[PDB]
Design a protein around this ligand. Structure first.
Ligand SMILES: CCCCCCCCCCCCCCCCCC(=O)OC[C@H](COP(=O)([O-])OCC(O)COP(=O)([O-])OC[C@@H](COC(=O)CCCCCCCCCCCCCCCCC)OC(=O)CCCCCCCCCCCCCCCCC)OC(=O)CCCCCCCCCCCCCCCCC
Ligand SMILES: CCCCCCCCCCCCCCCCCC(=O)OC[C@H](COP(=O)([O-])OCC(O)COP(=O)([O-])OC[C@@H](COC(=O)CCCCCCCCCCCCCCCCC)OC(=O)CCCCCCCCCCCCCCCCC)OC(=O)CCCCCCCCCCCCCCCCC
Ligand SMILES: CC(C)=CCC/C(C)=C/CC/C(C)=C\CC/C(C)=C/CC/C(C)=C/CC/C(C)=C/CC/C(C)=C/CC/C(C)=C/CC/C(C)=C/CC1=C(C)C(=O)c2ccccc2C1=O
Ligand SMILES: CC(C)=CCC/C(C)=C\CC/C(C)=C/CC/C(C)=C/CC/C(C)=C/CC/C(C)=C\CC/C(C)=C\CC/C(C)=C\CC/C(C)=C\CC1=C(C)C(=O)c2ccccc2C1=O
Ligand SMILES: CCCCCCCCCCCCCCCC(=O)O[C@H](COC(=O)CCCCCCC[C@@H](C)CCCCCCCCC)COP(=O)(O)O[C@H]1[C@H](O)[C@H](O)[C@H](O)[C@@H](O)[C@@H]1O
Ligand code: HEM
Ligand code: HEM
Ligand code: HEM
Ligand code: HEM
Ligand SMILES: COc1ccn2nc(C)c(C(=O)NCc3ccc(N4CCC(c5ccc(OC(F)(F)F)cc5)CC4)cc3)c2c1
Ligand SMILES: COc1ccn2nc(C)c(C(=O)NCc3ccc(N4CCC(c5ccc(OC(F)(F)F)cc5)CC4)cc3)c2c1
Lengths: 166, 161, 524, 524
C-alpha cells in the first residue's frame, strides 16, 4: 500500500483485512431493510421481555436464599413441608434466570445480527519446501557441529550415567 | 560446542498502520452492524438482568461460610451467652463448685487431681484447670471426652502463684 | 477506550494475531456442539468441586454422630461420612451444590459418549486426526475412573460395597502380581486407614490436572488443524465455509454455555441424586438389594454378572473368574484407541480427508458401530437385573440367561439389519435423484390413468422428463414444503393484522435476500 | 528418523514456527539465571509435593500414638501429626523427601527475592514491562502465603503457636469486620475442626494453580517481549546480541537445572530441617522459647515485636495494637506493585527502554533500594531477639530498644552512604577514561621524578598522552591482567610438558580466533 491508506471507507478496510487473512465474506445482509415497522418493534419487545424475566428471577433467587426457612425440621409432629421446598426453590430460581438470559441472547442473535457466509482458504498439507529444507539444515548443522557423532566414549558414558540415575 | 554470536532484529513498537486500521475496522463493523447502539431497551434490560443474576449467584456462593459470632449458644447461669465471653470457669447452675485441678501427665485414672494450699512453697508456680467433679476420671468414653475438651480450651489455663 | 487501547498497542503490538484470530471461520452444524457440552460440564464440575473442598474432611477414624439428623444420632461412623452429612444438613445451600456436582458428572459422561459416537460415524478420525482420536480415548478412560473415585468418597454402604467388590477383590485375583498390587494400593487388607485420603488426593488434584492438560492439547489440535465439514454446495477439500468468530461464533458459544448451566441448575434443584442419609455408614456385615454403580460402570458390572464361572486349578494355585472380566475390560480399552490404524490397514486408504461421510454411505462401519452399541446396551441392561425383574414381573434366572444369550445373538442381528438399512437409504436417495420429488398430488388423465406429479430438481428434456442428476454426497429434499412451496403466512402479530404495504415489502425483501444468498454461494 | 519426521510434517507442517523458535537469540549474562533458579525450585516443589500427598491425612481428630517412636507412645495427638510422624519414621525415604520439600521452599523464596533485587536495581521494569513487574509482585505475595500455609500443616507446638497468634489474633482485632472474618475462616473459635482440611485444600490445589497460571503468563510475556541487555560494543536499542537457542541455550539451561537439583538433594540429605518429633502435638497450655516463623515471615514477626503499645479506647469499643501491623503490612504490599508508576510520575520519563542501567549510574534509586534492604534486615534481625541475646551475651530489653531505634536511624544513614558511594564509583570510572589504566610500574626519570606508566585505551596525541574517551554506559577494565597482558602458560597437562610445535600452534590459533571475534563484533 501507501500512506494514503486513510480516506478509505470501512468496507474496503474490512475486505482488505479479510483478503490479508484469506477470508472472503460473501452475502452480508441486514435483517430489517425497511425502516421502523411494527414487526421490528415487536421483535425488540419480545427479545427484551426474556431478559427482564431473567433479571427478575435472579432477584427472586437472592431474596429466597436470604429469607427462606432452611434448617432441618423433619419429624412427624410438625410436618414442615417448608423445609422440603428449600432446595427446589434454589434450583427453580437459579436455573430459570440463567435460562431466560440464554434464550434472550439466542433470540437477539437470530433476529438482529446480520446473516453472513465466509470462506477460509484452508492451506493444508505439507509445508513449502523452503521451510522444510531450512529447518532440517538447522537441525543437522546443530547436530554435526557438536562433533558428538565421532565421540563414542562421551556418548556411551553419558547414556549409561543418565540411565543409572533415572 | 562452537562459539557463536547472533543478532535478532527486535522489531518493537506499535504495529504497522495496516494492521491497526484493519482490526479496528473489523471491531467497529462487528459492533455497528448488530444495531445494538440504537436499541436502548434491549441493552439496558440485558445489563440489569446479568447484574441481578451475577449478584444473586455470588451471594449464594459466599453465603454458606458466613456465621454470626454473637448468637447465644453456651448455657450459663444467666441464660445463654456468646462463645467469646464464656471461659469454662463460668458457673452453670448458680453455685457449683469448680476445683483447681492440676495435670499429672499419666492416664491410668487421673489426668486431673485436686489441690491443697500446702502443696506449694513460697517460690512456686503451677498451671491449673477447672475440674467440676461431675466430670470424673478418664475411664469411660464419656468422661474421656469431657476431659479432653477441658484440656483443649484457649481460655482455660491459669497460673497459681 | 482509545488511550488504553493505543498504549496496549505500543507495549504489545498484537494487532495481527488478534486479526488472525478474529477472522477464523467455523462451520455451523448442530452436530458440532456435542464437544462444547462436555467442555461446559467440565467447567461447572471444576467450580462446584472447588466450592465443596472447603467443607470435606477425608478421614476414616470413627466418631459418634451427635448432629441434627435425628434418625442417625448415636450411630458410629467415619469422619468422611459425617462431613458429607454436615454438608447436606448444616451448610446453607450445600445439598444443592453437591447435587449439581453429581448431575454435572453424569452429563459430562453422557456428552462424551455422544461426541464419540458422532466422531466415529461421520469418519472424522481419518488421516490428519488419528492422534486427536487417541487423546479423546484417553480422556474418556480418565473421566470414567475419576467419576468412580469421586462417588466413592463419602463412604456409605453402597460406595463401600462397590469399592470392596470391584477394586479390592478384582485386584486381589490377578494371576501373579495380585495381592502385591492390593497391598501397595490399600496399605494392607481391604478396610484400611489410608484409602479415603489417597482417593481424595487422586480425585481433587491428579486426575483433574491430567484431564485439564489433555483437554488443552485436544482443543489446540482442533484449533490449528481446522475443522472438518460436510459436502455441500460450495464446500471443497481446500476451504472452510461457515461464519467468522468475530460477531457470531463467540455469541452462539456463550449462549449455549448459559443454557447448559441453566439446565444443570434446574435438574440439580428439582431431582434428587445420591441421598446418602437414607443409607448408613459402611459396615462389612450389612448389605442392601440395589448395589449398582453409576451408568458408566454398569457395563463392567453386567459383564461380571453374566460371565459364566470358569476357573482353573492347577498345582498349588488358583485362577479365579474375575480375571476374565479384567482381560475383557483391558481388551476393550485397547481396542478403542487403536481403531483408525486397524481400519486403514484393512481398507488400505491413506489419503488426507477434510470432508465428512454420511453414515449411510459407509455401510460396514455403520454396522460395526451399531453392533458395538447393541453390545453395550445389553451389558448395561444386564446390570439392573433386580430392578427389571422386580418392577416388570420376570424371573431373575430368566434375566440372567436372557443377557447371557443376547450377548451372543443380538450383535450379529443388529449388524445384518443395519447393513440392509443403510443400503435401503442409499436406494431411496438414488430414486429421488433419478426422478423428481414426489408431491403427493394425483391426476386422472382422461383415459383413466393415475399419475403423481413429480417435481424436478434440475433441467428437463424435450418431453418433460427430468434428466438424472449425479450424487454428490449431500442430502436431498424429500418433502415439497421444505423447498419453498407453501409458505408466506400473514404478517400480523398473533391476533391483529398489519398493513398490506408492510407485508408486501417484508415478503419481497426476504425473497430477494434468500435468492441472493443462494446465487452467491453457488458461484464461488 | 526420516519417515516419522516427514509424516509429522505432512500432518502438521510446523517447519516454520520450529525454525522461528530455534533461531531466537538470548543474552548471556550471569545475572539472567536468577529466575531460572526459582523456576527449577518450583518444579522440584511440585514433584515432591505430589509424592507427599499419598501419605498425608489432614484431620484434627484425636488419637493415641501407638507407633514406633517410643518417647511419644501413649500421647494423645491429632491425625495430621500422626500422619507426619508416620511419613518420617515408617516410610522408606519419607524423611528425605519432606526435607527436600522444605529446603526447596526456602530456596524458592530466596531466589525470588534475589531476582526482584536484580530487576529493581538494573531498571528492567520501565515502559514496556510494568505489567510484568506487577505479575511478579503478585507471585511473591502468593509464594509467601503458600509457604506459610504449608509449614502450618503437620500441627505441632510451633506451627500451632504461629497459627494462633498471627492468623487468629490479628484477624480477630480488625476494626469492624474482625470477628466476622475470624468465624468465617475458622468456622468458630480458634481451635476448630475444619481448619487443617481447609488449609490442606488451599495449599495443594488452589494456590499452586494460581501460581502456575501466573508463572505461565510471566514466561509468555518474557518470551514475546524479547529480553533486555546491558550496553556494550555492538548492542543497540534495536537488536539482541547473544546466542541462539538451538545448540547452546537449551544445553546451558538443562545443565543449570541438573546442578540446582543436585544442590537441593545434597543439602536435603545432609542438613536437618523441622524435626517435628522433638516438638510435641499442639496443646493450648504449653509453649517453648524459640517461636519464630520461616525467614520470609520474620519481618512480620519483628514488626509486631518492635512496635510500641498504642491502643485507642473510645465509646464502648477498642482498637488494639496489631491493627498497626495490619495496616503497615498492607501498605508495604501496596507500595511494592505500584512503584514503576510512582517513578515515572516523579521523574517524568515515558520512553521505551531496552538497554539496562548500571546501578552506579542511578544514585537515587540505588540509595532507595539500599534503604529498603536495610529496613528489611533490621526487621528480620529483630525477630531473633532471644537467640541473639542468648548466644551473644546482650540484654533482651537492650535488643528491643536497639531494633526500635535502628528502625528509624539506619535507613537514612544507609541512604546517605549509598548515594556518596555511587558518585565515588562514577568518578573512579571517569578517571580511567581520562587517563589510561594504571599498570603499577614505577620509574625514576633521571632527574629524580617518579611516574607510574599508565596504559591508554585508545588513540594518543603528539606528545604521548592519550586523548580522553567518552562514557558509553559500559564497564571499563581496571587491572592490566584482565586485558591480555601476562598470559599464555605452558601447554602440558599438569606435570609433563607437550611439544613446542603443539604449544605454538594452539597459542597462535587461539590468538587469531580472539582477534577475529573482536573485529567481527565491532564492525556490525
Ligand atoms: C492448559 C489448559 C488451558 C485450557 C484449555 C484452553 C486452551 C486451548 C486453546 C484454544 C484456542 C487457542 C488460541 C490460539 O491458539 O491463539 C494463539 C495465537 C497465535 O496465533 P498464530 O500466529 O496464528 O499461531 C502461531 C503460528 O502462526 C501457527 O501457524 P501454523 O498454522 O503453521 O501452526 C503450526 C502449529 C503446528 O503444531 C500443532 O498443531 C500442535 C499444537 C499443540 C501444542 C502442544 O504449531 C503451533 O503454532 C502451536 C502453537 C501453540 C500455542 C497455543 C497452544 C497453547 C495450549 C497448550 C495446552 C497444553 C499443551 O496467539 C494470539 O495472539 C491470540 C490473541 C490473544 C493475545 C492478546 C494480547 C493482549 C495484550 C495482553 C495484555 C497483558 C496483560
Ligand atoms: C500421555 C501423553 C500424551 C498421550 C498422547 C499419545 C500420542 C498420540 C500419537 C499417537 C500416534 O498417532 O502415533 C502413532 C502413529 C504411527 O504412524 P503411522 O505410520 O501413521 O501408523 C501406521 C502404522 O500402523 C504404525 O502405527 P502403529 O501400528 O504402531 O500404532 C498402533 C497403536 C496401538 O494402539 C494402542 O495400543 C494405543 C496405546 C494405548 C494402550 C493402553 C490404553 C490404556 C492406558 O499405537 C498408538 O496408538 C500410538 C500411541 C502411543 C501410546 C499412547 C498411549 O503416528 C502418527 O500417525 C502421528 C505421528 C505422532 C505425533 C507425535 C506424537 C508424540 C510422540 C508420543 C510421545
Ligand atoms: C453458587 C451455587 C448456588 C451455584 C454455582 C454454580 C456455578 C457453575 C455458577 C456458574 C456461573 C457461570 C459463569 C454462568 C455463565 C454466564 C454466561 C456465560 C453469561 C453470558 C451469556 C450471554 C448473555 C453473553 C454473550 C456471551 C459472549 C458475547 C461473550 C462471553 C463468552 C463466553 C462466556 C464464553 O464461554 C465463550 C467461549 C468461547 C468463545 C467465546 C465465548 C464468549 O464470547
Ligand atoms: C493412562 C491411563 C488412562 C491408564 C489408566 C490407569 C488407571 C486405571 C487410571 C488412573 C489411576 C491412578 C493411580 C493414576 C496415577 C496418576 C498420578 C496422579 C500421576 C501424577 C502425574 C505426575 C507424577 C505429576 C508430577 C510431575 C509434574 C507435576 C511436573 C511437570 C512440570 C510442570 C507441569 C511445568 C511447569 C513450568 C512451565 C509452565 C514452564 C515450562 C518451561 C518453559 C516453557 C521454558 C523456560 C524458559 C522460558 C519460557 C523463557 O521465556 C526463558 C527466558 C529467558 C531465560 C530462560 C527462560 C526459560 O528457562
Ligand atoms: C456476601 C455477603 C452476604 C452474606 C449473607 C449470608 C447470609 C448468612 C446469614 O444471614 O446468617 C447471619 C449473617 O448475618 C449477616 O447479616 C451477615 C452480614 C455480613 C457481616 C459481615 C460480613 C462477613 C465478613 C467475612 C465480611 C467479608 C467482606 C469484607 C471484605 C474483607 C476481605 C475478605 C477476605 C448469621 O446467622 P448464622 O446462624 O451465624 O448463619 C448460619 C450459621 O450459623 C450456620 O453455621 C450455617 O452453616 C450458615 O450457613 C448459616 O446458615
Ligand atoms: C473430555 C473429553 C472430550 C472433550 C472435552 C472433547 C472436546 C472436543 C471439541 C470441543 C472438539 C471440537 C468441536 C467439535 O468437534 O464439536 C473435539 C473434536 C474432536 N474430538 Fe473430542 N472431546 C472429548 C472426547 C473425545 C473422544 C472420546 C474422542 C474419540 C474424540 C475425538 C475427537 C476428534 C477426532 C475431533 C476432531 C473432529 C473434527 O476436527 O472435526 N474426542 N473434541
Ligand atoms: C472432573 C471430573 C469429576 C467427576 C466426574 C466428579 C464426580 C464426582 C461425583 C459423582 C461425586 C459424588 C458427589 C455426591 O454424590 O455427593 C464427587 C464428589 C466429590 N468431588 Fe468430584 N468430580 C469431578 C471433579 C472434581 C474436582 C475437580 C474436584 C475438586 C477440585 C472435586 C471435588 C469433589 C469432592 C470434594 C467430592 C466429595 C464431596 C461430596 O461427596 O459431597 N470433584 N465427584
Ligand atoms: C508451590 C510452592 C510450595 C511451597 C512454598 C510449599 C511449602 C511447604 C512446606 C514448607 C511444607 C512443610 C513440610 C514439612 O515441614 O514437613 C509443606 C508441606 C506439604 N506440602 Fe508443600 N509447598 C508447595 C507446593 C506443594 C505442592 C504443589 C504440593 C502437592 C501437589 C504440596 C504438598 C505438600 C504436602 C502434602 C505437605 C504436608 C506433608 C508434610 O507436612 O509432611 N506442596 N509445603
Ligand atoms: C515465582 C516467581 C518468579 C519467577 C519464576 C520468575 C522468573 C523469571 C524469569 C525466568 C525471567 C527471565 C530470565 C531472567 O530474567 O533471568 C524473569 C524476568 C522478569 N521478571 Fe521474574 N520471576 C519471578 C518473580 C518476579 C518478581 C517478584 C518480579 C518483580 C519479576 C519481574 C520480572 C521482570 C520485569 C522480568 C523481565 C526482565 C527482563 O526482561 O530482562 N519477576 N522472571
Ligand atoms: C456399587 O455396587 C457395586 C456392586 C457390584 N459391583 N461389581 C462391580 C465390577 C462393580 C463396579 O463398581 N465396577 C467398576 C470398576 C471395575 C473395575 C475396577 N478395577 C480397577 C482395579 C483393577 C486392576 C486390575 C488389574 C490391574 O493390572 C494392571 F496394573 F493394570 F496391569 C490393575 C488394576 C482392575 C479393575 C474399578 C471399578 C460393582 C459395584
Ligand atoms: C511460628 O511461631 C510463631 C511465633 C510467634 N509469631 N508471631 C507472629 C506474628 C508469627 C507469624 O507467623 N507471623 C506471620 C503472619 C502474620 C500475619 C498474618 N496475617 C494473616 C491474616 C490477617 C488479616 C488481617 C486483616 C484482614 O482483613 C482483610 F481481609 F484483609 F480485609 C485479612 C487478613 C492479616 C495478617 C499471617 C502470618 C509467629 C509465629
Amino acid at each position: 500500500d501507501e500512506a494514503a491508506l486513510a480516506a478509505m471507507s470501512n468496507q474496503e478496510l474490512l475486505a482488505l483485512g479479510g483478503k490479508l487473512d484469506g477470508v472472503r465474506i460473501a452475502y452480508k445482509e441486514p435483517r430489517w431493510p425497511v425502516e421502523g415497522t411494527k414487526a421490528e418493534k415487536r421483535a425488540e419487545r419480545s427479545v427484551a421481555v426474556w431478559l427482564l424475566l431473567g433479571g427478575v428471577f435472579g432477584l427472586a433467587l437472592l431474596l429466597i436464599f436470604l429469607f427462606w426457612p432452611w434448617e432441618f425440621k423433619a419429624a412427624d409432629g410438625e410436618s414442615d413441608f417448608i423445609y422440603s421446598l428449600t432446595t427446589p426453590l434454589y434450583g427453580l430460581t437459579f436455573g430459570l434466570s440463567i435460562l431466560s438470559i440464554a434464550i434472550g441472547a439466542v433470540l437477539y442473535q437470530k433476529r438482529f445480527i446480520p446473516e453472513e457466509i465466509s470462506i477460509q482458504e484452508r492451506h493444508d498439507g505439507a509445508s513449502r519446501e523452503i521451510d522444510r529444507k531450512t529447518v532440517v539444515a538447522n537441525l543437522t548443522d546443530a547436530f554435526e557441529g557438536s562433533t558428538i557423532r565421532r565421540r563414542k566414549l562421551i556418548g556411551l558414558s553419558f547414556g549409561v550415567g543418565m540411565g543409572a540415575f533415572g | 560446542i562452537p562459539e557463536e554470536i547472533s543478532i535478532q532484529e527486535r522489531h518493537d513498537g506499535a504495529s504497522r498502520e495496516i494492521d491497526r486500521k484493519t482490526v479496528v475496522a473489523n471491531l467497529t463493523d462487528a459492533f455497528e452492524g448488530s444495531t445494538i447502539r440504537r436499541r436502548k431497551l434491549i441493552g439496558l434490560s440485558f445489563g440489569v438482568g446479568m447484574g441481578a443474576f451475577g449478584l444473586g449467584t455470588l451471594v449464594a456462593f459466599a453465603g454458606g461460610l458466613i456465621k454470626n459470632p454473637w448468637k447465644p449458644v453456651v448455657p450459663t447461669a444467666e441464660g445463654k451467652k456468646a462463645v467469646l465471653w464464656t471461659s469454662g470457669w463460668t458457673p452453670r447452675y448458680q453455685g457449683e463448685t469448680i476445683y483447681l485441678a492440676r495435670a499429672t501427665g499419666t492416664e491410668d485414672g487421673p489426668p486431673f487431681i485436686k489441690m491443697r494450699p500446702e502443696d506449694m512453697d513460697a517460690g512456686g508456680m503451677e498451671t491449673v484447670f477447672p475440674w467440676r467433679e461431675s466430670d470424673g476420671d478418664g475411664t469411660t468414653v464419656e468422661s474421656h471426652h469431657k476431659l479432653q475438651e477441658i484440656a483443649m480450651g484457649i481460655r482455660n489455663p491459669v497460673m497459681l502463684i | 477506550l482509545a488511550r488504553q487501547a493505543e498504549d496496549i498497542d505500543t507495549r504489545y503490538h498484537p494487532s495481527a494475531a488478534l486479526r488472525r484470530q478474529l477472522n477464523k471461520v467455523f462451520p455451523t452444524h448442530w452436530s458440532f456442539l456435542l464437544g462444547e457440552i462436555a467442555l461446559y460440564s467440565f467447567v461447572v464440575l471444576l467450580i462446584t468441586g472447588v466450592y465443596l473442598t472447603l467443607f470435606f474432611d477425608p478421614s476414616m477414624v470413627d466418631v459418634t454422630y451427635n448432629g441434627v439428623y435425628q434418625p442417625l444420632r448415636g450411630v458410629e461412623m467415619s469422619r468422611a461420612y459425617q462431613s458429607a452429612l454436615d454438608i447436606s444438613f448444616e451448610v446453607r445451600g450445600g445439598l444443592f451444590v453437591r447435587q449439581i456436582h453429581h448431575w454435572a458428572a453424569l452429563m459430562f459422561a453422557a456428552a462424551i459418549m455422544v461426541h464419540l459416537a458422532r466422531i466415529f460415524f461421520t469418519g472424522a478420525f481419518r488421516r490428519p486426526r488419528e492422534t486427536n482420536w487417541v487423546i479423546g480415548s484417553l480422556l474418556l478412560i480418565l473421566a470414567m475412573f475419576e467419576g468412580y473415585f469421586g462417588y466413592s468418597l463419602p463412604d456409605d454402604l453402597l460406595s463401600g460395597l462397590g469399592l470392596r467388590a470391584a477394586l479390592s477383590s478384582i485386584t486381589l485375583g490377578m494371576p501373579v502380581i495380585g495381592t502385591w498390587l492390593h497391598w501397595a494400593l490399600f496399605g494392607g487388607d481391604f478396610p484400611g486407614t489410608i484409602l479415603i485420603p489417597r482417593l481424595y488426593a487422586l480425585h481433587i488434584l491428579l486426575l483433574p490436572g491430567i484431564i485439564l492438560a489433555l483437554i488443552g492439547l485436544h482443543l489446540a489440535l482442533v484449533w490449528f488443524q481446522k475443522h472438518t465439514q460436510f459436502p455441500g454446495p460450495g464446500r471443497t477439500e481446500h476451504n472452510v465455509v461457515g461464519v467468522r468468530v468475530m460477531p457470531v461464533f463467540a455469541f452462539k458459544s456463550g449462549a449455549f454455555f448459559a443454557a447448559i448451566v441453566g439446565v444443570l441448575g434446574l435438574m440439580g434443584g428439582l431431582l434428587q441424586i445420591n441421598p446418602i442419609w437414607n443409607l448408613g455408614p459402611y459396615k462389612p456385615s450389612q448389605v442392601s438389594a440395589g448395589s449398582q454403580p453409576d451408568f458408566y460402570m454398569m457395563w463392567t458390572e453386567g459383564l461380571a454378572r453374566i460371565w459364566p464361572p470358569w476357573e482353573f486349578y492347577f498345582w498349588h494355585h488358583t485362577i479365579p473368574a474375575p480375571v476374565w472380566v479384567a482381560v475383557i475390560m483391558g481388551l476393550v480399552f485397547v481396542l478403542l484407541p487403536a481403531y483408525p490404524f486397524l481400519e486403514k490397514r484393512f481398507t488400505g486408504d491413506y489419503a488426507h480427508h477434510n470432508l465428512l461421510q454420511r453414515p449411510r454411505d459407509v455401510p460396514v462401519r455403520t454396522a460395526i458401530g451399531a453392533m458395538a452399541i447393541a453390545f453395550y446396551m445389553v451389558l448395561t441392561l444386564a446390570a439392573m437385573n433386580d430392578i427389571i425383574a422386580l418392577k416388570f414381573h420376570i424371573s431373575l434366572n430368566a434375566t440372567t440367561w436372557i443377557g447371557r444369550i443376547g450377548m451372543v445373538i443380538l450383535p450379529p442381528f443388529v449388524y445384518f439389519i443395519t447393513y440392509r438399512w443403510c443400503i435401503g437409504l442409499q436406494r431411496s436417495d438414488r430414486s429421488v435423484l433419478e426422478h423428481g420429488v414426489e408431491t403427493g398430488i394425483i391426476k386422472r388423465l382422461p383415459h383413466g390413468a393415475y399419475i403423481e406429479l413429480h417435481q424436478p430438481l434440475g433441467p428437463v428434456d424435450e418431453h418433460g422428463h427430468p434428466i438424472p442428476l449425479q450424487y454428490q454426497g449431500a442430502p436431498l429434499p424429500k418433502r415439497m414444503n421444505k423447498l419453498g412451496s407453501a409458505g408466506s403466512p400473514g404478517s400480523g402479530s398473533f391476533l391483529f393484522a398489519d398493513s398490506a404495504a408492510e407485508d408486501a415489502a417484508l415478503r419481497e425483501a426476504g425473497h430477494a435476500a434468500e435468492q441472493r444468498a443462494l446465487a452467491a454461494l453457488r458461484e464461488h
